């Protein structure tokens, strides 16, 4: 959800496997459908 | 890493796309049109034989007959070496 | 000179024949020293067969017509009591190496 | 000469492989790129030429 | 006119559009091109087995339709 | 020193592969390698083992192991190509053991271990195969004396 | 008449397509549903789908409502025939309940196989009797009044199958020495069908075994001039060998 | 990515108790949930 | 006859396996790797003044994911080599520094990036 | 009939979708249900995940919430088949307990391998019997009435395999000395499929020694005309070569 999907254009809950509706947010799990290389550039944070 | 893109694979994919467009242009215009929609080659969505029977206006019998004729024509060994190695 | 061989019971040159005191590669080395003459343009297959204890020599080979061994005293292998050696030597006519 | 070096066949094939496939398709020894790669991996004499 | 004669010689025997008898007779001997028949002299096709005068007349009318002639004719 | 076999040596190179039951399923050693010509698999046995004494080259097949499943996201172009040619119904990936580049030799010995037999194996794996390839390297350019 | 079992449903496709029930014909009706029934009958019990049946029977151009037409044809067949014979399977239709020997096609294949086995075993009389009883199952022209390209294809297939059955019966009758009817039937076949030259080769064998020589050479000249005029290719080496064996008076053939 | 038509996207505004307002897209065919997290502070 | 043989010392690369943590090609004879282009190599190419050869050895032929595939395509198709991008290892450097609470931002002449 | 043991559960994919439980039928059900059971049958007993089966039934656009649909299809299979013949692992579905001869496809590969082994050994009678048993396996069109482009893929694959199997059958029939049923089958198949070059080469080979030359080259000319009209190219060089050696009439291959 935070860093990005591990496959290409897939989401965590197993739905939205198709490439056509890219750039949308899944309702079940919130994972943006996009490339797997975005996990090389997306960071989060820890609140202390 | 298995997720790393292989340049040979991408070159093979784009050449497969170009050669598929070329062999589609090789066939007749109407046959190219009907095959472009059966597997939805033109767009991201394939279409059924009843779905294309309204815009073009033919029976299920005739549309599946010309479809199977296109598959048989592409199944001929002449138009195979351009695609057999492409798997 | 001999350019190809075949031994019954042997699938590659790195194994050993059951019943000879040295391995197959040493037999390859001994075959290379065997000098022959052949007037046939086509490859000619000789035959080598020896059974029982003894010492197989180049004279024990069986050459066809138009092929003869010229150094029959050359040692090839040594057979014990359980030695099986059937060998089809091919000779070809050529020059150089 | 002063400006020459001698590469082996395998080295020059693996270094210049994409150029070899491009020229093979240009010289139509193979029908397409995949067949050119197949010949290069197989290593026929036309590839060396 | 070099391109025209090259195209005429390069056409196969299927474009002749004539009877099966003469086509089978010429393909039996191994002839598969119009220029191959052109290079043949009169005695080359007058010695063909089961090749009557009707086949020769039909072939002559055919080539006359395409406008060319035989060798030394 | 080349024609008299003076300076030459036997070089036996060992490299193995094993079959394991992963999450998708267990890979098997077999004969029916997908999407390959029959001539490539001409020197295999029934259980997927290269014959003892089979001459091998770079890129050749030694033992035929098929990956039980890979992720299937077929493009419409590949879908219609599969419809044209017809593809085998089990979806398998060609991850069988092949000879590395620039290596030649004779298969001089094969060793097969099975989980179903009494032989011990590491956890997870089911079949383990070892293939020895031997070449008689002669002296040539670049050898160090 | 000895196999006329009570309650057995029999069908015939070697001639006009008809339905027989206990020796009584059934109202087949339209020739088009007859074509559909023959399409299901010619498979020797093998099933089919509706789509392939329509594509094979109705050519490239079916009308806009072919599915309702084939459905009502099959429904009419369901009234006229037994309900259990015609069954629905995955949207397709098939003929079931066919007993052994009821269909003329399956009986013809079985008798041909039995004749081949008897010929391999040396029983020539049993083989010729079996394939003469099988040849009596043909009711003239195959598929009378049956339209469609499929009808033409199986018409040609059954015609050449009958012709080759007659050819093998003819050659083993020549081997049996009964040339009197064989010569007349060979002449009738050559007059009817000038295309299958194995029949003329059997005619050469019959003429050589009969005794006359000059007429055989006249027939050879006629065959040669026809294969020169309409074909023009050289004669087969087997035909030339047979001709030179006839000319050399080989006592082995006589 | 050539010739592919993206799905239509609608803008739905989410507001938290701390007053943070952010815009993120939803698919037209996808159901709109009234519950979501905050991009700034993670509040409801 | 030494064991530093020539039949195994030969090794060449066109496009093979790549490292995971950074997108440079990996190394090793059995793994179809690429020869390391060390620091003194870069010093020598600076000394020649050959900016383009050094720049492409550092960007085109390694660690540019949008560059290597495009260059392979351009070579096979026969067209000219495309312009290089940014090596992925520098982006790894930026992401590493940005996580040590160092506000590392790249700004161009007009503005930020 | 000799392999009908007690407790045997026979499955069939070469013909339509059916189940034989010691001689009595089982209702395989919906066309999508038939496709699901066939897709489990083609995989010789994998645990295949739910998404893969969903793709196999439908392809690119399966309805969104139809995972429970495939669940209730699995329930249908479990209540119409044995409780233990179908077992689920990690959400995947798997049919086990399939003995030898239970699947006609496994028997088909077994018969093909046995025929290949007999051809390698040079035997003719046993290989002919094996392929005679193999040609009795298919019943009509394969995978009758099942949706899914996956099903189309194994349909065309099994059809092509059947084409090469009949090519081998006709080839050994020609080489062993069978011509009449050979030319009958070749004519029937070229009537069914007009654009196969290999079967027309087989036509030329069969008619070349059975005593038929004019219609063979007529069919060849028709093939050339259709191939020029639909493809506009030249046929394979092996064909022209086969027609060439035919023309000089070599008796070597007699
Ligand atoms: Zn999701």
Residue numbers in the entry:
A (entry chain D): 50 to 97
B (entry chain F): 424 to 510
C (entry chain A): 50 to 146
D (entry chain D): 437 to 485
E (entry chain K): 239 to 311
F (entry chain C): 727 to 871
G (entry chain J), J (entry chain I): 17 to 270
H (entry chain G): 19 to 62
Please share excerpts from the published article on this structure.
Streptomyces antibiotic regulatory proteins (SARPs) are widely distributed activators of antibiotic biosynthesis. Streptomyces coelicolor AfsR is an SARP regulator with an additional nucleotide-binding oligomerization domain (NOD) and a tetratricopeptide repeat (TPR) domain. AfsR null mutants show defects in afsS transcription, as well as production deficiencies in actinorhodin and undecylprodigiosin. It is presumed that upon binding of AfsR to a 22-base pair (bp) binding box (afs box), RNA polymerase (RNAP) holoenzyme is recruited to the afsS promoter, allowing for transcriptional initiation. We find AfsR uses its SARP domain to engage the afs box and make extensive interactions with all RNAP subunits except ω subunit.
Notably, when assessing the transcription activation of full-length AfsR and ΔTPR, we observed that they exhibited lower levels compared to the isolated SARP domain, indicating that the NOD and TPR domains exert an inhibitory effect on the transcription activation of the SARP domain. Preincubating dephosphorylated AfsR with ATP or GTP significantly enhances its transcription activation. Besides, the activation of AfsR was likely triggered by ATP binding rather than ATP hydrolysis, as evidenced by the comparable effect of preincubation with a non-hydrolyzable ATP analogue, ATPγS. The MS results revealed phosphorylation at T337, the last residue of the Walker-A motif of the nucleotide-binding domain (NBD). We tried to find out the interplay between SARP and its C-terminal domains during transcription activation by assembling AfsR-TIC. AfsRT337A was used to eliminate the interference of E. coli endogenous kinases and ATPγS was used to active AfsR. The final cryo-EM map was refined into a nominal resolution of 3.63 Å. But the density extending from the C-terminal of SARP was very ambiguous and could not be improved by 3D classification and local refinement, presumably due to the high flexibility of the NOD and TPR domains relative to the SARP domain. The structures of SARP and RNAP in the AfsR-TIC resemble those in SARP-TIC, indicating that the SARP domain in the full-length AfsR and the isolated SARP activates transcription by similar mechanism.
